[PDB]
Amino acid sequence: DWEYHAHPKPNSFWT
């Protein structure tokens, strides 16, 4: 059994 992964914040593309 596996829950949904911790998908990253896409905003950091602009860092």
Side-chain angles (χ1 to χ4, degrees):
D1 178 61
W2 304 277
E3 61 184 274
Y4 183 69
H5 78 287
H7 167 97
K9 190 97 299 182
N11 179 255
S12 316
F13 181 81
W14 301 110
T15 308

Coordinates of all heavy atoms in Angstrom, one line a residue:
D1 N 0.8 -1.2 0.0 CA 0.0 0.0 0.0 C 0.9 1.3 0.0 O 1.9 1.3 0.7 CB -1.0 0.0 1.2 CG -1.8 1.3 1.2 OD1 -2.5 1.5 0.2 OD2 -1.7 2.1 2.1
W2 N 0.5 2.2 -0.8 CA 1.3 3.5 -1.0 C 0.2 4.6 -1.2 O -0.6 4.5 -2.1 CB 2.2 3.4 -2.1 CG 3.2 2.3 -2.1 CD1 4.4 2.3 -1.4 CD2 3.2 1.0 -2.8 NE1 5.1 1.1 -1.6 CE2 4.3 0.3 -2.4 CE3 2.2 0.4 -3.6 CZ2 4.6 -1.0 -2.9 CZ3 2.4 -0.9 -4.1 CH2 3.6 -1.6 -3.7
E3 N 0.3 5.7 -0.4 CA -0.4 6.9 -0.6 C 0.2 7.7 -1.8 O 1.2 7.3 -2.3 CB -0.4 7.7 0.7 CG 1.0 8.1 1.2 CD 0.9 8.8 2.6 OE1 0.7 10.1 2.6 OE2 1.0 8.2 3.6
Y4 N -0.5 8.8 -2.1 CA 0.0 9.8 -3.1 C 1.3 10.5 -2.6 O 1.3 10.9 -1.5 CB -1.1 10.7 -3.5 CG -0.7 11.7 -4.6 CD1 -0.5 11.2 -5.9 CD2 -0.4 13.0 -4.4 CE1 -0.1 12.0 -7.0 CE2 0.0 13.9 -5.4 CZ 0.2 13.4 -6.7 OH 0.6 14.2 -7.7
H5 N 2.3 10.5 -3.5 CA 3.6 11.1 -3.2 C 3.5 12.6 -2.9 O 2.5 13.3 -3.3 CB 4.6 10.8 -4.3 CG 4.5 11.7 -5.5 ND1 3.5 11.6 -6.5 CD2 5.4 12.6 -5.9 CE1 3.9 12.4 -7.5 NE2 5.0 13.1 -7.2
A6 N 4.5 13.2 -2.2 CA 4.6 14.6 -1.9 C 5.1 15.4 -3.2 O 6.2 15.6 -3.3 CB 5.4 14.9 -0.7
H7 N 4.1 15.6 -4.1 CA 4.4 16.4 -5.3 C 5.0 17.8 -5.0 O 4.5 18.4 -4.0 CB 3.1 16.5 -6.1 CG 3.1 17.5 -7.3 ND1 3.3 17.2 -8.6 CD2 2.7 18.8 -7.1 CE1 3.1 18.4 -9.3 NE2 2.8 19.3 -8.4
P8 N 6.0 18.2 -5.7 CA 6.8 19.4 -5.4 C 6.0 20.7 -5.8 O 5.1 20.6 -6.6 CB 8.1 19.3 -6.2 CG 7.7 18.5 -7.4 CD 6.7 17.5 -6.8
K9 N 6.4 21.8 -5.2 CA 5.8 23.1 -5.6 C 6.4 23.6 -6.9 O 7.6 23.7 -7.0 CB 6.1 24.1 -4.4 CG 5.4 25.5 -4.6 CD 4.1 25.6 -3.7 CE 3.0 24.5 -4.1 NZ 1.8 24.7 -3.3
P10 N 5.6 23.8 -8.0 CA 6.2 24.2 -9.3 C 6.7 25.6 -9.3 O 7.4 26.0 -10.2 CB 5.0 24.0 -10.2 CG 3.8 24.2 -9.4 CD 4.2 23.8 -8.0
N11 N 6.3 26.5 -8.3 CA 6.7 27.9 -8.3 C 8.2 28.0 -8.2 O 8.8 29.0 -8.7 CB 6.1 28.5 -7.0 CG 6.5 30.0 -6.9 OD1 7.3 30.3 -6.0 ND2 5.9 30.9 -7.7
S12 N 9.0 27.1 -7.7 CA 10.4 27.1 -7.5 C 11.2 27.1 -8.9 O 12.4 27.3 -8.9 CB 10.8 25.9 -6.6 OG 10.0 25.8 -5.5
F13 N 10.5 26.8 -10.0 CA 11.0 27.0 -11.4 C 11.5 28.5 -11.5 O 12.4 28.7 -12.3 CB 9.9 26.8 -12.4 CG 10.2 26.9 -13.8 CD1 10.9 25.9 -14.5 CD2 9.9 28.1 -14.5 CE1 11.3 26.0 -15.8 CE2 10.3 28.2 -15.9 CZ 11.0 27.2 -16.5
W14 N 10.9 29.5 -10.8 CA 11.3 30.9 -11.0 C 12.3 31.3 -10.0 O 12.7 32.5 -10.0 CB 10.0 31.7 -10.8 CG 8.9 31.4 -11.8 CD1 7.8 30.7 -11.6 CD2 8.9 31.6 -13.3 NE1 7.0 30.6 -12.8 CE2 7.7 31.1 -13.8 CE3 9.8 32.2 -14.2 CZ2 7.4 31.2 -15.2 CZ3 9.6 32.3 -15.6 CH2 8.3 31.8 -16.1
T15 N 12.8 30.5 -9.1 CA 13.9 30.8 -8.1 C 15.2 30.9 -8.9 O 15.9 31.9 -8.8 CB 14.0 29.7 -7.0 OG1 12.7 29.5 -6.5 CG2 15.0 30.1 -5.9

